[PDB]
Design a binder for this molecule. Structure first.
Ligand code: OLA
Length: 269
């Protein structure tokens, strides 16, 4: 059980996350209303939400997504798309642990995720900060599904501490770094990380702990099945680094479970 507030936020950013896959939301002109095709993001279409910056095939690893201005909810949202292109997958396979001592001492991160964020950080950082400067009363949130949630996590770790808080909402994200990085993400201030998983979705179980990867705490585990509407009673908060009460269980994993976080995700064309 989580509160309705958290449930509402989780649902909303799940939808900004889903909206990132829509091709049209990756090269839209600035100032256009953000919409999606289907039933991907009805709460987003509420606004009142417009593109600050759309992007596709940026840097290394085909970085894709958008930066949005949400005037109703008063948000500046950086939404990274998860895996779709061959280039993304090649990057997902760059799974060696590289030092990111520049972010936190003794930390290591997925070579591809970090290289990807690294290749677009200077540009994305300026755009977010330009937005903060124009809308000081807006809240900055980074979000994404899977690979997109990995990116948002690394981006949040890198960009906090610059005068504005950054909350990160990740949906079915893989592990991103070693134990030191898991610890750091657990205690880092200047924003909160909401790492959300769903049933036996295989992605948050990768890469393995036996490759040296670790998950930060806490975890919000959705227990309702695939294609099943989520209620706030279906989300359980699980604590402890690499905790096993949620998605990290020694049972058979599932792929369809990866595509259902509140609603369909990773399916918008
Ligand atoms: C269907 C079985 C898939 C098994 C994948 C094993 C991956 C092993 C090591 C790390 C690669 C991580 C890739 C994560 C993919 C998520 C990307 C996404 O869905 O947006």
């Amino acid at each position: 059980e989580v509160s309705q507030d958290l449930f509402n936020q989780f649902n909303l950013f799940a939808q900004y996350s889903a909206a990132a896959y829509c091709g049209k939301n990756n090269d839209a002109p600035a100032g256009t209303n953000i919409t999606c095709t289907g039933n991907a993001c009805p709460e987003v279409e509420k606004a009142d939400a417009t593109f600050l910056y759309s992007f596709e095939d940026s840097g290394v690893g085909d970085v894709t997504g958008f930066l949005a201005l949400d005037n109703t909810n008063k948000l500046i949202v950086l939404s990274f798309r998860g895996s779709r292109s061959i280039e993304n997958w090649i990057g997902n396979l760059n799974f060696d642990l590289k030092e990111i001592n520049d972010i936190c001492s003794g930390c290591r991160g997925h070579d591809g995720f970090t290289s990807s964020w690294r290749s677009v950080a200077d540009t994305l950082r300026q755009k977010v900060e330009d937005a903060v400067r124009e809308h000081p009363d807006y809240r900055v949130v980074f979000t994404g599904h899977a690979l997109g949630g990995a990116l948002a996590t690394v981006a949040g770790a890198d960009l906090r501490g610059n005068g504005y808080d950054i909350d990160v909402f990740s949906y079915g994200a893989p592990r991103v770094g070693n134990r030191a990085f898991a610890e750091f993400l657990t205690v880092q201030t200047g924003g909160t990380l909401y790492r959300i998983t769903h049933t036996n979705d295989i992605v948050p179980r990768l890469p393995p702990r036996e490759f040296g990867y670790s998950h930060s705490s806490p975890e919000y585990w959705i227990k309702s099945g695939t294609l099943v509407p989520v209620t706030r009673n279906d989300i359980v908060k699980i604590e402890g680094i690499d905790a096993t009460g949620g998605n990290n269980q020694p049972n058979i994993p599932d792929i369809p479970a990866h595509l259902w976080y509140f609603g369909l995700i990773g399916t918008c064309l």
